[PDB]
Amino acid sequence: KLALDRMRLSTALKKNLEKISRQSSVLMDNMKHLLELNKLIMKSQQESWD
Amino acid sequence: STKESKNEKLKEDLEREQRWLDEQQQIMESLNVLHSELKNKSESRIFNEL
């Protein structure tokens, strides 16, 4: 069930890529926040490894 | 936030463990030296002492 739902979401999101780039959304702010958080998370993970 | 807290605790524990390791190395070296010195080194003598 999860795989089917993920594939459906993936194709439905790929079909409308340019609309989420021209006038996209506050989703762009959400994406930039996620992009800012992921790098710090990975750096902390590497430090913990060492 | 949780990863940051984990990293801080890890650094503190690292410092404490380093200090403990140094002290334990000193103690073990002293104990080995004492054992070596001890290993390196009859009522007549008791009566003569008295």
Side-chain angles (χ1 to χ4, degrees), chain A residues 1-17 20-21 23-50, chain B residues 1-36 38-39 42-50:
Chain A
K1 179 178 180 297
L2 181 60
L4 180 59
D5 282 348
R6 285 309 176 188
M7 287 187 176
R8 266 214 296 263
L9 177 57
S10 168
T11 178
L13 199 60
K14 173 192 172 180
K15 206 258 298 181
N16 284 5
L17 185 55
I20 330 167
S21 48
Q23 73 302 328
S24 307
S25 165
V26 301
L27 257 192
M28 262 298 298
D29 310 64
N30 294 331
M31 294 316 170
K32 82 176 182 62
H33 286 306
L34 266 52
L35 192 69
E36 185 69 24
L37 292 173
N38 293 332
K39 177 176 55 183
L40 275 67
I41 289 180
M42 297 161 184
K43 183 172 54 182
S44 45
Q45 289 173 357
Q46 301 180 13
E47 187 176 4
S48 316
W49 294 348
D50 195 8
Chain B
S1 159
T2 56
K3 293 294 296 182
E4 294 174 347
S5 297
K6 176 178 182 296
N7 280 17
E8 301 296 331
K9 183 180 182 56
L10 277 184
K11 287 179 294 184
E12 183 178 351
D13 273 358
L14 176 65
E15 175 188 5
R16 202 182 301 107
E17 290 283 343
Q18 183 69 50
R19 179 168 54 89
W20 279 340
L21 171 63
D22 272 338
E23 293 183 357
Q24 205 156 358
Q25 262 180 349
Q26 252 183 336
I27 278 194
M28 175 56 184
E29 183 65 278
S30 165
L31 188 64
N32 214 335
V33 170
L34 191 141
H35 173 54
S36 87
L38 191 140
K39 192 59 176 298
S42 63
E43 44 80 30
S44 315
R45 52 179 170 184
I46 306 187
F47 188 67
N48 289 132
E49 290 167 357
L50 296 177

